[PDB]
Design a protein around this ligand. Sequence first.
Ligand SMILES: Cc1cc2nc3c(=O)[nH]c(=O)nc-3n(C[C@H](O)[C@H](O)[C@H](O)COP(=O)(O)O)c2cc1C
Ligand code: SF4
Ligand code: SF4
Ligand code: SF4
Ligand code: FES
Ligand code: FES
Ligand SMILES: [K+]
Lengths: 430, 264, 87, 214, 42
Amino acid sequence: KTSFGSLKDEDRIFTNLYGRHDWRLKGALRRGDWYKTKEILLKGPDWILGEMKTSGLRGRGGAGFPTGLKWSFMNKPSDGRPKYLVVNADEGEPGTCKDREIMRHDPHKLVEGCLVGGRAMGARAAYIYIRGEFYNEASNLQVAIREAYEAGLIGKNACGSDYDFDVFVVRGAGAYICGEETALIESIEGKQGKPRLKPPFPADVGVFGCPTTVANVETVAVSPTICRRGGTWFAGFGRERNSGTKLFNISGHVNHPCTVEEEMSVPLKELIEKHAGGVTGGWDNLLAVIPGGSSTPLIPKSVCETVLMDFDALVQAQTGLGTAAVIVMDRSTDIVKAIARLIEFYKHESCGQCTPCREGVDWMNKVMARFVKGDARPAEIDSLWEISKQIEGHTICALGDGAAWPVQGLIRHFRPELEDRMQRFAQQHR
Amino acid sequence: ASNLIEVFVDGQSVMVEPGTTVLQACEKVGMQIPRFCYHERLSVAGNCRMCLVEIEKAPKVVAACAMPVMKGWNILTNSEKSKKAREGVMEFLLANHPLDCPICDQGGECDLQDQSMMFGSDRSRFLEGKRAVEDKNIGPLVKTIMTRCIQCTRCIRFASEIAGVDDLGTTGRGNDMQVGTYIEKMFMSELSGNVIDICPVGALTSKPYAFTARPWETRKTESIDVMDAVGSNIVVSTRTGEVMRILPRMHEDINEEWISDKTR
Amino acid sequence: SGVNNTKKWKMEFDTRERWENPLMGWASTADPLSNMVLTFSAKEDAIAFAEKNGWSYDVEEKKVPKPKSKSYGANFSWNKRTRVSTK
Amino acid sequence: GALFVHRDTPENNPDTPFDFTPENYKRIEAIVKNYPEGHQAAAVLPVLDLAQRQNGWLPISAMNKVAEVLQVPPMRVYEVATFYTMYNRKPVGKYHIQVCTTTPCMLRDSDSILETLQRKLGIKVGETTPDKLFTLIEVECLGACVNAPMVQINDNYYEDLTPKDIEEIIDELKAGKVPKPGPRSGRFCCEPAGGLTSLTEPPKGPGFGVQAGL
Amino acid sequence: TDTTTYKNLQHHDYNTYTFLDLNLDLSKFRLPQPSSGRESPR
Ligand SMILES: Cc1cc2nc3c(=O)[nH]c(=O)nc-3n(C[C@H](O)[C@H](O)[C@H](O)COP(=O)(O)O)c2cc1C
Ligand code: SF4
Ligand code: SF4
Ligand code: SF4
Ligand code: FES
Ligand code: FES
Ligand SMILES: [K+]
């Protein structure tokens, strides 16, 4: 294909994204979940791993790492230790609600994906680390897991396939850094939500010191539909190496902010003006878009004209596809105030373990507050760029990179706005 | 090369055991990687990020204290990327470090000062206001001025692993993460002045030794301890014919790097 | 933690009497070789210097730190006691 | 405004009467059985959350009781409690309103929601009404950004808020009823306003699009 | 087969003990947990 978009509802995976049908076991069975999953488990781990590899599904977390390879890191004989699958149900990234929606509306998809992935790597248990603020979603997931346990899909015979699997749900207590892989592993282990260094990787030493794989809710939930419908269909959707179907969370200055399920490689303009109802005031009123959540930088309207929703397309646009969170800001937006609010969020949510992220993100927050006030001089823009470059790549996890990137994007694109603010402040104060 | 792997430090070849870290291979060659949180007798923490080095044919700098060498790695230690990483990390430490050097017990004994002069920049761009953290009262031996703390978790790791008390830790998050005890508790055990030794900054200093002299003044006389039958090797720090201080000596067969509170 | 001061051999002298000055309380000495510290690149060089100068010497062998087995993954063990409880 | 130190006060000394109910002890036993043997220290967060749910806030006696129950160091318990944000280490009101103020909620004008809440309750952010009924704080992203602006009261999300809507929500809470969660703009959840742009045709059902050989 | 009514209303009448009550209910459905061979890491 060449033009991507206009996804069909008969091809959409999350058929009950919008909560219009029953989310219970009977509703999931009527929608097609838990179908031939016994046959999938009897087909076994190599077949499922090959199916995900040929599907070409990438990480929905924002890392973008190939799911088939990542899950195939655990295809090893046991060394006397159990092996674990962990589901990142944190979803603390701003602009993002897709994990929340599919947890509260198709939880049996998540449970079936937990079973399928745990069989794919070889595992006894899937721990779902859910956000602590999602109390209704967590209770909803527990009701679904209870239904699965009573139906015999999980526990002591996984859908009658001679496989012992157990799905637990563990709640967080309000930390965005607990959405990280290793920090989430530590949070399950009962310490603080501080990420641990790599190596050792979680595929070797992870939760409780066992081999484990942390995967996103969207990835886990689309795993069994990928297995049922084949990897060829999922690879057919989307462009080359950016294949399949994505949940886009459009918010901000749009007429109808919403979560939608759309094919990959859709144009950003097509996605916004098809599902969000367009920018408030129009595409001419549109100023900037953050296309992958707060960790990815911003892009202006000029490159928003003809940009796609690929990992590779956004990297070529000097950005990334993170959690597919499309935050739209029109001409009425205070762009420096929005970016400084994001940096303040990163200051509040940094775990403080490692020096570059801790001190540099606090420093960036102070400099961005002064930038919003206009209380600086244009050399401080280059100083802030160098500070962000010192933070990026020198930290333990990628929160430092995800906090340095919005400042980089704002300095790269909206530098005359910053200079105008500083000049206006200098005029009206002297 | 029996059970050994070949690596390179600045192009110089060296045999190392598998599991050897980049820092250990570098010190086998004979070069000391900068550090703040790594201690060879504590567990690996990897938080201060001072030990970032550039491996050849690798884009991201790695932490030398934690990353083990794989095979044939050329560790560029004095490269431009390594110097830039050290300068950035030193800048981030000294951004919020307090201007307390004249009133601090780490006069010439400061790793932060010495590594600043050896690897960091010579000036600052920090135009903001620094943070301040209220002090603790963990006992009559260890005086705490916790504004100077750089959060390297050395004291926490020592208390957890060697003292075995599990009394210290980090409370909070972000820039407001404070090392200490949440409650008003006294860190009063044997082997409790070793946090004064291993704290690189002057956050944990000695209260009897407070404000008494300076390390350049103190002459170092190497002696043996008689307060027990271990016979721990010590340095008596003497100034002007006065015994000022007792420090441990390295002896791997008797007392390693630590001495008891009685002898200290 | 720096080790650049433990590379070269040194020869010093036995400590003699330092007393208190009656006028100002300063440290007074009667020996000239109080601050005499000599630096050598080798133990045999220092021993040769002491023997040619006729001083009786006491030589101490250099204590190099033993190579430690450091592993970051030991902090997160399944079954061993090396699992740390905090960071 | 929170301080990560403990000051010995008569309301928060380590002698305030806290102990789990027998039902809470059964729940603690269920959590410990949920985690693997030898790693019962991993059950600190659910047990501390259960203590908070029983007591309201978390006193230092509750922290020490959790440490005693799980046989873990109290300093580790203090580490967890001070690290994680939604553990209340000081007493809060009966209704704990958290207004999200992160960038998409700011774009959808959560500031007006915050100012109307401040004017209605007569309090600033981070403080408590004098009748110990409402605590109002600012928070970061709460995971519902397409429904901005939104608040969280106890365990319930109130979404798509207007100043009028949050006024009736406060009136309902003062009257003592359940204001019911969800968006207040007429849409049930994250669906686009003014009709569905997708998922209009009903789902196909089992045995649709199944590859051969499965 | 209705598609015009929200069907998550079961989350409206949830108390503050729903999650832990469900956890206690599912405590009988699980596998025996693995052991590290020691009672704690001490
Ligand atoms: C600060 C930070 C926060 C993150 N938050 C999340 C999150 O809420 N959910 C998530 O799935 N991944 C999150 N990630 C990315 C995880 O590293 C990644 O999702 C995880 O390794 C699973 O990979 P996957 O995308 O292949 O599923 C976060 C990463 C960082 C650095
Ligand atoms: S990068 Fe930030 S969030 Fe990650 S370990 Fe370092 S301080 Fe913590
Ligand atoms: S710890 Fe070092 S850098 Fe800090 S005030 Fe003391 S002497 Fe100065
Ligand atoms: S008090 Fe000293 S040893 Fe402890 S974390 Fe701070 S700087 Fe490190
Ligand atoms: S010495 Fe390696 S990060 Fe601190
Ligand atoms: S930014 Fe407010 S809920 Fe996400
Ligand atoms: K010190």
